[PDB]
Design an enzyme around this catalytic site. Structure first.
Site, PDB file in Angstrom:
ATOM      1  N   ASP A 179       5.808   2.516 -15.018  1.00 49.34           N
ATOM      2  CA  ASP A 179       6.036   3.550 -14.039  1.00 49.34           C
ATOM      3  C   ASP A 179       4.698   3.853 -13.380  1.00 49.34           C
ATOM      4  O   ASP A 179       3.670   3.854 -14.051  1.00 49.34           O
ATOM      5  CB  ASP A 179       6.601   4.787 -14.727  1.00 49.34           C
ATOM      6  CG  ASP A 179       7.411   5.637 -13.792  1.00 49.34           C
ATOM      7  OD1 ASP A 179       7.708   6.802 -14.140  1.00 49.34           O
ATOM      8  OD2 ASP A 179       7.753   5.131 -12.699  1.00 49.34           O
ATOM      9  N   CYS A 213      14.439   0.952  -9.672  1.00 50.64           N
ATOM     10  CA  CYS A 213      13.513   1.229 -10.769  1.00 50.64           C
ATOM     11  C   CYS A 213      14.082   2.550 -11.274  1.00 50.64           C
ATOM     12  O   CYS A 213      15.285   2.635 -11.487  1.00 50.64           O
ATOM     13  CB  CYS A 213      12.047   1.332 -10.289  1.00 50.64           C
ATOM     14  SG  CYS A 213      11.668   2.024  -8.658  1.00 50.64           S
ATOM     15  N   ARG A 219       8.167   1.157  -7.666  1.00 47.33           N
ATOM     16  CA  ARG A 219       8.192  -0.255  -7.973  1.00 47.33           C
ATOM     17  C   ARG A 219       9.104  -1.009  -7.020  1.00 47.33           C
ATOM     18  O   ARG A 219       8.778  -2.124  -6.585  1.00 47.33           O
ATOM     19  CB  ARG A 219       8.590  -0.435  -9.438  1.00 47.33           C
ATOM     20  CG  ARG A 219       7.473   0.082 -10.364  1.00 47.33           C
ATOM     21  CD  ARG A 219       7.899   0.222 -11.826  1.00 47.33           C
ATOM     22  NE  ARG A 219       8.625   1.462 -12.053  1.00 47.33           N
ATOM     23  CZ  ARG A 219       9.093   1.846 -13.235  1.00 47.33           C
ATOM     24  NH1 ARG A 219       8.901   1.079 -14.306  1.00 47.33           N
ATOM     25  NH2 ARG A 219       9.778   2.974 -13.334  1.00 47.33           N
ATOM     26  N   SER A 220      10.229  -0.382  -6.677  1.00 43.07           N
ATOM     27  CA  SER A 220      11.196  -0.981  -5.759  1.00 43.07           C
ATOM     28  C   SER A 220      10.567  -1.214  -4.399  1.00 43.07           C
ATOM     29  O   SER A 220      10.784  -2.259  -3.773  1.00 43.07           O
ATOM     30  CB  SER A 220      12.414  -0.071  -5.617  1.00 43.07           C
ATOM     31  OG  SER A 220      13.140  -0.028  -6.843  1.00 43.07           O
ATOM     32  N   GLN A 260       4.397   4.299  -4.459  1.00 46.48           N
ATOM     33  CA  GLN A 260       4.020   5.600  -4.977  1.00 46.48           C
ATOM     34  C   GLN A 260       2.574   5.844  -5.354  1.00 46.48           C
ATOM     35  O   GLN A 260       2.201   6.978  -5.657  1.00 46.48           O
ATOM     36  CB  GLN A 260       4.915   5.907  -6.166  1.00 46.48           C
ATOM     37  CG  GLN A 260       6.301   6.270  -5.723  1.00 46.48           C
ATOM     38  CD  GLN A 260       6.364   7.699  -5.298  1.00 46.48           C
ATOM     39  OE1 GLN A 260       6.172   8.597  -6.106  1.00 46.48           O
ATOM     40  NE2 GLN A 260       6.623   7.929  -4.025  1.00 46.48           N
TER      41      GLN A 260
END
Ligand SMILES: CC(=O)N[C@@H](Cc1ccccc1)C(=O)N[C@@H](Cc1ccc([C@@H]2CC(=O)NS2(=O)=O)cc1)C(N)=O
EC number: 3.1.3.48
Length: 296
Positions: A179, A213, A219-220, A260
């Site tokens: 994450d 994710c 992550r996507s 992110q």
């Protein structure tokens, strides 16, 4: 982008570039996601699909699912980014895969991460323990799986109980991408992406691949940004005109928060620069990426 990358690294300005992007990012209404009745269909109160690009379930009951259609026009590829389903939205999730005619699902998280549940166990782990989603009338069965060091490819059989039809869905599970983190290396990331590409899951003959994710943005976004940038540099007269930040902003018009961390942005550059090696003519790199990924 390679000269850009160096200058950015050199100046230690990643967080600045990344912040500029967050500032410029589109802001679109998310009314439906915010309806009182959909509170339990949202994993994070701050991660919602824009109304204009949200995926609609084909049900009159409530057509809401926290999923967005990222339609990249120039790259000629569409991706559906959704959150890791909740215990109560696994039926919706698979109803969406059926309805959207997806052939593959790309999971970039683990159900448990740092001692917390980030996504429901939405697919069967044992062939003899198939899952039945009574609300959407679907059935999911694990046919076989191919486990590698850092990712697992599963062959699933989704059956629409109402129509008696069956479809094979390929599940591509990256198990070691943390994450708010980045893959082990560009080769391991690229070996995974090209595996997805080779399966045929990303072809226009199929519905949009479903990528997720936990929130369906970090992550996507990274996965989708690198794939799209690689398609762009293969379609453009000048493979050098591809502006990663501009492409990311384009993607953020369809779903908020894609990418992110400033380091996930940096990793995307690394990934794309390396991947370009294949795009520009040298297919050998692929074989090399597998070695460096050490999937065995
Ligand atoms: C319970 C909950 O939704 N908590 C909210 C915080 C909140 C917002 C508004 C009001 C009250 C609480 C929350 O944690 N949201 C999360 C959303 C979020 C969760 C997970 C990620 C992950 C980052 C990544 O690399 N991959 S990903 O699965 O997109 C990215 C963003 C957060 N901000 O970290």
């Amino acid at each position: 982008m390679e000269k850009e990358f160096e200058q950015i690294d050199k100046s230690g300005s990643w967080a600045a570039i990344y912040q500029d992007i967050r500032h410029e990012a589109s802001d679109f209404p998310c009314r439906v996601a915010k309806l009182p009745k959909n509170k339990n269909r949202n994993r994070y109160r701050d991660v919602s699909p824009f109304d204009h690009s949200r995926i609609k379930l084909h049900q009159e009951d409530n057509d809401y699912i926290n999923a967005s259609l990222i339609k990249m026009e120039e790259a000629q590829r569409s991706y559906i980014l959704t959150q890791g389903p909740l215990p109560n939205t696994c039926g919706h999730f698979w109803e969406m895969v059926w309805e959207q005619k997806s052939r593959g699902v790309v999971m970039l998280n683990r159900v448990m991460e740092k001692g917390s549940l980030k996504c429901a166990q939405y697919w069967p782990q044992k062939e003899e323990k198939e899952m039945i989603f009574e609300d959407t009338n679907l059935k999911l069965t694990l046919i076989s799986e191919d486990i590698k060091s850092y990712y697992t490819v599963r062959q699933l059989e989704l059956e629409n109980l109402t129509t008696q039809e069956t479809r094979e869905i390929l599940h591509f599970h990256y198990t070691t991408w943390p994450d708010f983190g980045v893959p082990e290396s560009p080769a391991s990331f690229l070996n995974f992406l090209f595996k997805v590409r080779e399966s045929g899951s990303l072809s226009p003959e199929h519905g949009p691949v479903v990528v997720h994710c936990s929130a369906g943005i970090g992550r996507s976004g990274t996965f989708c940004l690198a794939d799209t940038c690689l398609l762009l540099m293969d379609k453009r007269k000048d493979p050098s005109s591809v502006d990663i930040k501009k492409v990311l902003l384009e993607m953020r018009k369809f779903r908020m928060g894609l990418i992110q961390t400033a380091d996930q942005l940096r990793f995307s550059y690394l990934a794309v620069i390396e991947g370009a090696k294949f795009i520009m003519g040298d297919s050998s790199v692929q074989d090399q990426w597998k070695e460096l990924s050490h999937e065995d």
